[PDB]
């Protein structure tokens, strides 16, 4: 009706004003400023360890706070906690639903979370007097499939589902403290800020949104992509984050600038990006692709600094340790490989 | 030498035990067929669910027939993009389908002259020619044959398929809709579409599922071992 058309015109005017403001704040591209920096050599990451034991496609992984314990889910109905230093298996968590699509590790090292098509985020307790891993709480309420879970503390977890919503949970109560709405498509990946007050979520609508955890309101929207955003990761500094799409391009956005900074793409690269993770210093933007290898990107020069090709199938997981010691890559071949830079 | 402390050796033993448990669980899981029930909204899904046997997600109904324990996955509750979760079902041995015969005369809820049978045909196209399922055999079950028999007596199938130049009897009509749902396949060389009309009884249909999965596992094992 007339009111709907008027509201649509008002929204279009607001979008035009926002675009004009972003253009006005755009003076020089990030490449020109970093044109004079010394470029990195050829990163020659080599497989230092391999981790076998899974019997199906590994879908997610996460590193612990101590940079030594890692947890991976592989749609075999198992959540294996590995000791990266000695390849030994600390635990083997049996899963009620074998369609786990995400996994997480609490920063305190006491809990591990998982979820999938069951619409349920299962919080597991590792430090139990009984010695076995039990289900502390089964968070329910999401209509769509869970895509990624991350721990804020031992009593709070933020989860993104396929019902175009992101939710913050209280594990003790089991109720959704705050529900984040605003996405038109399915939310596929989220990354928490180092200071744990904000988090970005990438959705199928080719947009990235910043949320305030306490306020429960979307602060900014980031567009520019042409396909679904399947990965996201904050810069260590917390003032920027990188996105992964199915259009074979990884993009870095700045929070304060509220606009695009640099596009990471190559002509020979045609497959999408599944996972993205920055390094300790933020110079390397590690990204896993579907062409069976993970490519190392110069986060300040858009130059391919190396290739991590050791997998026989699609790379579905990635993670850089808290201390920057090593990187971990999970792929559908039921293999996790730990990589490190040769001295 | 060993260079392993007492705790390191004990941790190695615990890791070996966990690996043994994983191997045993994988052995149990491999000898267990997985079926994915896809289909329209109410295209005989319930009847299939009844005869073969918290959150709006995957419903896993497990049923056994002559030591061939199955796990049949109803995923008709995920109201999300299919291309974002259909990649989880890669090792599925069947993509069991349920198509309603009465949909030929009915129209979709959002009435725009969109035949429900045509919608089922459209759904079949996106699953029979999907990029992932290149060696998965569909067990398409043409449901509600009785209603089709009654409805074909008065309502002509021409309103559903204009080109159809047969009679108005169940025989020719069914033969034609079965042919139409079977010709959408573009990779007949690799996979097959085992068709079957759902019987009123709840005892002979599951036999067809048994037979179809037996044939497909035979073919899978044979090609994996290597004969073609």
């Amino acid at each position, epitope marked *: 009706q007339s009111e709907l058309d008027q509201l649509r015109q008002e929204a279009e005017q607001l979008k035009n004003q926002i675009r004009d403001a972003r253009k006005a704040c755009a003076d020089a591209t990030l490449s020109q400023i970093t044109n004079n920096i010394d470029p990195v050599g050829r990163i020659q990451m080599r497989t230092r360890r391999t981790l076998r034991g899974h019997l199906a496609k590994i879908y997610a992984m996460h590193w612990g706070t101590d940079s030594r314990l890692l947890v991976s889910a592989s749609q075999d109905g198992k959540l294996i906690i590995w000791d990266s230093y000695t390849t*030994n298996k600390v*635990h083997a968590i049996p899963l009620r639903s074998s369609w786990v699509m995400t996994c997480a590790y609490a920063p305190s090292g006491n809990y591990v979370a998982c979820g999938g098509l069951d619409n349920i985020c299962s919080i597991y307790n590792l430090k139990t*007097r*009984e*010695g*076995n891993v039990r289900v502390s709480r089964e968070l329910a309420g999401h209509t769509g499939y869970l895509s990624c879970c991350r721990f804020l503390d031992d009593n709070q977890i933020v989860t993104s589902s396929g019902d175009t919503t992101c939710a913050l949970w209280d594990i003790e109560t089991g109720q959704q403290t705050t529900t984040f709405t605003g996405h038109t498509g399915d939310v596929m990946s989220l990354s928490l800020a180092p200071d744990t007050r904000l988090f970005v979520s990438g959705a199928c609508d080719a947009s990235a949104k910043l949320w305030d955890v306490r306020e429960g309101m979307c602060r900014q929207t980031f567009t520019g992509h042409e396909s679904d955003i399947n990965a996201i990761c904050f810069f260590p500094n917390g003032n920027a984050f990188a996105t992964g799409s199915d259009d074979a391009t990884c993009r870095l956005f700045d929070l304060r600038a509220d606009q695009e900074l640099m596009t990471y793409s190559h002509d020979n690269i045609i497959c999408g990006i599944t996972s993205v993770s920055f390094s300790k210093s933020g110079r390397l933007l590690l990204a896993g692709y579907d062409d069976f290898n993970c490519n190392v990107w110069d986060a300040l020069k858009a130059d391919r600094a190396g290739v991590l090709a050791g997998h026989d199938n699609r790379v579905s997981c990635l993670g850089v340790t808290d201390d920057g010691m090593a990187v971990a890559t999970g792929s559908w071949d039921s293999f996790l490989k730990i990589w490190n830079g040769s001295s | 030498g060993c260079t392993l*402390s007492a*705790e390191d050796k004990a*941790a190695v*033993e615990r890791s070996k035990m966990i690996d043994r448990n994983l191997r045993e669980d994988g052995e149990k899981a491999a000898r267990e067929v997985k079926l994915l029930l896809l289909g329209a909204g109410e295209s005989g899904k319930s009847t299939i669910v009844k005869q073969m046997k918290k959150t709006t997600g995957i419903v896993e109904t497990h049923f056994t027939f002559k030591d061939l324990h199955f796990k049949m996955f109803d995923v008709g509750a995920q109201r999300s993009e299919r291309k974002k979760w259909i990649h989880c079902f890669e090792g599925v041995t069947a993509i069991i389908f349920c198509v309603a015969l009465s949909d030929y005369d009915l129209v979709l809820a959002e009435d725009e002259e969109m035949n429900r049978m045509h919608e089922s045909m459209k759904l079949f196209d996106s699953i029979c020619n999907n990029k992932w399922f290149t060696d998965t055999s569909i067990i398409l079950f043409l449901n509600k044959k009785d209603l089709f028999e009654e409805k074909i007596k008065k309502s002509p199938l021409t309103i559903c398929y204009p080109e159809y130049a047969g009679s108005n009897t169940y025989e020719e009509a069914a033969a034609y809709i079965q042919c139409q749902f079977e010709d959408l396949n573009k990779r007949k060389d690799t996979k097959e579409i085992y068709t079957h009309f759902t019987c009123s009884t709840d005892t002979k249909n599951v036999q067809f599922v048994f037979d179809a999965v037996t044939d497909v596992i035979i073919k899978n094992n044979l090609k994996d071992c290597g004969l073609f």
Partner: single-chain antibody
Amino acid sequence: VQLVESGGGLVQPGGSRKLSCSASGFAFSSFGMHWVRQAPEKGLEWVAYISSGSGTIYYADTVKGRFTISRDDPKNTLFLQMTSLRSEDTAMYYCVRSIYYYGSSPFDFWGQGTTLTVSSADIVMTQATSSVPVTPGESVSISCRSSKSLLHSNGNTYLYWFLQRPGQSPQLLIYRMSNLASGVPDRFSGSGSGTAFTLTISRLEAEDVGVYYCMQHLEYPLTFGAGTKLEL
């Protein structure tokens, strides 16, 4: 978590006996079991150990061959088949639980213990002090020394601290020389470099009087210290 043991009593020397430890409230299969003996008015002494899944079984030098340790995972029971008993075996035997992994807490739970009465390369542990008078509210320290450095190449130091309250089974206080167990207050702390290890009890009060034992876990023939007695 609860362990009860039975089968003890007066036995004629040269006979045989069978001790049983009943497990309840925890996953007995994933846990390794130990037997620790304590002679009357003497120190602890390790007896046997069976790994989870019965993969490896070790024994002490003084009891090799005679003692037979086995477990029955389905029924949650630990056994100790004992034959040819001498006068030196008079002690009250304990059933000790210990799981081993990264971050694990070995020797965490100690059973009540059944009483039994009859009518080298091992890392020697020395506790120079034997009796330290204490006063409530004061901070006391206990020293324990080893012949061989316990610091392994992997960064771990395998020395454990135990507390035996009078008439009670010992409870774990500090494992691996720095980590505090679960349920023990923060007032307990330990340190040391590679041979001299000290445990500091800041703001000592009641329920802290007892005998403190230091044990190594580098080489499997574990040796317990003489033990220090705190007098109030």
